[PDB]
Design a protein around this nucleic acid. Structure first.
Ligand code: NA
Length: 91
DNA sequence: AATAAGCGGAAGTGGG
DNA sequence: TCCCACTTCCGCTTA
């Protein structure tokens, strides 16, 4: 199954949920979630995964934080903002 | 208080 | 066996 970071990168490339997520500086890989519309995107992630429970932004962000150590996605010190690694962007 | 984002330890689930 | 890649639950912190 698709990994969370790839799900997000694919959404940003397709523009299918542009009211829930958007690039801040695509060259740097920085992106931001919508305060009011992020839950719809979280719901889609859980359904794509076939998880038992409804997915929430809190649980999705809990998973995102685990990428901090390996580097695929890091939290930026701006509201709802994160950054993909160069390696993720290149693939 | 109400609302919201952010955090992570711990235990559970999936598919190797 | 035992790690993958999260998921779920819970309690806490800061603004
Ligand atoms: Na929030």
């Amino acid at each position: 199954k698709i990994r969370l970071y790839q799900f997000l990168l694919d959404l940003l490339r397709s523009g299918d949920m542009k009211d829930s997520i958007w690039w801040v500086d695509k060259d740097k890989g920085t992106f931001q979630f919508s305060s009011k519309h992020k839950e719809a995107l979280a719901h889609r992630w859980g359904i794509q995964k076939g998880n038992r429970k409804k997915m929430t932004y809190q649980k999705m962000a809990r998973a995102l934080r685990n990428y901090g150590k390996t580097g695929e996605v890091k939290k930026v010190k701006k509201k709802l903002t994160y950054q993909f690694s160069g390696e993720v962007l290149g693939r």
